[PDB]
Amino acid sequence: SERIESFVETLKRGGGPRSSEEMARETLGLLRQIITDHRWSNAGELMELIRREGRRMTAAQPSETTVGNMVRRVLKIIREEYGRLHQLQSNIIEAINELLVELEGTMENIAAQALEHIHSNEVIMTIGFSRTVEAFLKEAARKRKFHVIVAECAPFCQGHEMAVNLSKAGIETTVMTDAAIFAVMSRVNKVIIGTKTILANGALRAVTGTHTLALAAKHHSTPLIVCAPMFKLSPQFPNEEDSFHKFVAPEEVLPFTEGDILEKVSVHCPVFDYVPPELITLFISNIGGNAPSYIYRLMSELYHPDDH
Amino acid sequence: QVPTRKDYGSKVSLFSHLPQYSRQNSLTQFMSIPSSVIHPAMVRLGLQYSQGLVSGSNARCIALLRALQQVIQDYTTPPNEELSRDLVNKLKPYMSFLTQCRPLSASMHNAIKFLNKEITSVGSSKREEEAKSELRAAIDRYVQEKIVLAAQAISRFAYQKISNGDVILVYGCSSLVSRILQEAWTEGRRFRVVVVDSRPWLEGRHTLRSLVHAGVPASYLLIPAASYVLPEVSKVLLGAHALLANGSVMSRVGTAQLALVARAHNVPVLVCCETYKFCERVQTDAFVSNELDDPDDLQCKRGEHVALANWQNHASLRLLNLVYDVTPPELVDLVITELGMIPCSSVPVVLRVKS
C-alpha cells in the first residue's frame, strides 16, 4: 500500500533512526514490497517504477544518502539479474535477501580488524559520536590501556554521550572543547573520525568540525583513518553546491533571548562540512582495507552508469 | 607439545604485542632426538633460522618450499582419510612451529596459502604417487615461474633507466638489486655505485664484496651520515620485500629514513620488488607489525667496553632493535615490477588481475 507515503513523510519531518541500517532496513523494506507485488511488465517497467519511486524518495531531505545509495544498488542487482536472465522475481528477491543478510553484519566484521591497528599506550583521538567507531574501539579493550581524546564540538553537540558510553567500560577518556584542538594534536597519534557519507572522488562529508581537524593531521603528519562501512559510497562528485548540508534553526547557536541584537545580525548554522581526499590516509571498510586513491574503482564495483 | 615461550628481558613499554626472542635454542631443553614427531625435516631449517643462517627476505621461500617439497614427498595417506583434509590439517602445527621460531613471514606465507590452495585443489580419486608427484611437481613449477623466471625478466626493464653517467645507490644487502644492477655492467654503460649500511648486522659488506668481483667501482658509507652521497646521487634503487596495498613499502629498518631524507635534495627514489611479494594487508605505522630481535647484539667493544651487557643489571634501560619500517607512497616514485613499471598508487591494481 501507500504506507511509503508515510515513510515519505517520515523522512520529511526528520527524527533520525540513528543511521544504524534502519534507513537501509526500511529502504530494503519498501523496495522489497514494491518489488513484491506491483504492476508487471517484462521490459523494466519495474525498473521504471524504481526510477519513479526512487526520485520521489530522493525528494526527501537531501542528506540521507543511504536511501538513494541502497536504491541504486537495488537497481544494479536488477541490471545484473536481467543480464544473467538473457521467474525473475524469485532471483531478484532472493538476491535482495542476500544483500540484506550481508548488510546484517557490518558493525562486527568492520570491528574485528581492530587489534591490528591500535597498540599499547597510544593516544588515539576522535570527534563526534558514531556507532561504528564506538563498537570498533570497544573490541580493542582486550589490549592495553591507551587514552582517548574526544572533542566536544558541533553544538548542538551529540558528542558526550559517547564519552559516557566509553569511559564507564574502557580507557581513560578526556573531553576537550572544540576550540582547543591545536594545543592538543601536538601530543597525539592515530586520529579516527566516523563518516556521515563519503563521495566519489574520495571525500568525507561529516560532522561540522571534521575540517579544521584534518588540517591539523596533515600539519603534524599523523595518519587519520575514517572507518566507514560499505553502502555509503556515494556517486555524484561534489558538483551540487550548498545543498550539501543541513542548515538548522539558529536557536541552537543563539538563544531567542537578548532582544534587538537579533534584529540586524546574521546567524549561520551548518551541520556538515567538507573533507577533501587530499588528507585521508586509509579507509577501514567492510571487506578490505583499501587506500584513498583506489576508492574510485570500488564504486564501479557496485553501481552502473545510471548514477543520476 | 611445542613449549615455545622463553621470552627474555623487558620489552620497551609501547609495544607489548610483539614478542622478543633470545638464542635459547628452542628445544635445547625441549626436543627429542629419535624422530620427534613435530618435524621429520623442518626441525633442520627451523634450527637453521634462529641462529642467523639463512635470513635474506628471499630464499626463505625457497627454503620452505624445499622442505615442504620433501615432507610432501614423504606422506603416507592413512586408511581412513581423503588425504586432502588429512595432510592439509597435518601441515598446520609444523608451520606453526616455524612460526614460533621466528616471526613467520615477510610475505612468505603467500607461499603457504598457495600450498593450502594446491593441497585443497587435489582430486578425490587418484594414486598417492600420482597426486603426490603432481603436487611436488606443481610446487616446483611455482618456484620456477614466480621466483626463477621472473627476476631475470625484471632486469630487462631496469636497463632502460640505468644508463651511462648516473651514480646509483643501493642499500645494504638485496636479492634482486644485485642481479638487475650487475646484469647492466655486462652490456656496457659504465657508472659508479655507492653503498650505505646500517649499524648492527652490517649487511652492506655482502654487496661491497659481491660487486667488486663484477668490476663496477664502489664507495662505502654508514646510514648515520648519508647526507654526502645525496648531493651527488642520480637515483636510489632501494629495493624491498613487502608491498602493502596502501602503497607501503616494508623495507629493512634503515630505508625511508633515507627516502624522506632524499626528497629534500631532489633526487628520485625508485623501488624494485617482485610480483608475489606484495600482500593484501594494510598498515599505517611501524608499531603494529615489527619484529624485535635479541637486544644483546648492540655491544661496541670500543675501548673499555662501556657496559652494554651490564644493562640487564642496570635499572630502567630497555634497548630496542627493530627490524622493519614503513615507506608511505607520497615519498615513493615508480615501482619496477615484473609486469611493467607501474605507478605506486596502483599497488592494488596488480592484485585483482591474476586472481
Added chain:
Amino acid sequence: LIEYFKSQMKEDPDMASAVAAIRTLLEFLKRDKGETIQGLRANLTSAIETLCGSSVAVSSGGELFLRFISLASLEYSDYSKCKKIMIERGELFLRRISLSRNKIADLCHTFIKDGATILTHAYSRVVLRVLEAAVAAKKRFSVYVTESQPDLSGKKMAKALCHLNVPVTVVLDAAVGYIMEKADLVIVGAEGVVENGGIINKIGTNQMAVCAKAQNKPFYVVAESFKFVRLFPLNQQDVPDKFEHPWVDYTAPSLITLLFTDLGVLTPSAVSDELIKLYL
C-alpha cells in the same frame, strides 16, 4: 600519403591533428597489398613514415590504432581477417573518436562556479568546446589567458573567445604570480598524458602548476581518449626527443586534480588501471 594526410588536415578547422593521421592511416591502410601478418609491419614502417614531421599525440595514435588493428590477430582468419571488420568497426571507432569531445563537455560543464575567473594557458580546441557550451547554457565567468611566447597562440583564444562574447583579459606569461591572487579553478587541456597521470602540454605549464598548489587553488586537466601512452618519465631533462628551443614540459601527478576523459570523469590515479587494462 604525406600529401594525403596534409590534405586531410588542410581542410579542417577542427578534428584532431591526431585524428587526421588516424583517418590517413585508415584509408592508406585500406588500399594496400599483403593481406597477411608481416604486411602490418610495413604499416609499422608507415607508422614511422607518418611519424615524420613532433607532436607526441601522433605517436600515441600510432600505437593506438596499431593496437586496434593489431587485436585482429586474435579471432584468427586468413586473407579476409576481421581487421576488415575493423574497417567499419574501425570506421565506427573513428566516429567513436569523432563524437568524443561532446561527452567530455557534457560531463565537464557543471564545474564552472558562477562568478568564477577561469585561467588558461593555451590555445585548445576542446577547452573552447566545453567553455562555449558553458556560456551557452549557464552563468557568467571571466577568463584570463597568457600568450605562449614562441607561438603567441593564446591570442587566438582571445579572438575566438571574444566571438563567444565573454569578458577576457590577457596578460603576458611572466607575471602569472600576479594573476593567481585573483583567480580560481585553473583549467588547461593537454597534448599527452603519461602512465602515472601526468600531463605534457606547452612549455609553460609547470611554471604555473607549481604555483597552483601553493596558493591552494585547484588545477584540472582535460583530454580525449587519445593521449594514453606507455611512456614513463621521472624527471625533467628525461623527456624524449620532442623539442631557446624547448617545446613541451612535464607536470607531476602530485599536482593534477580530477581530470576528464571520454571514458568518464576520472581521478589522477586510475589512468594506470585503464592502460594496464588495455596493454595486457
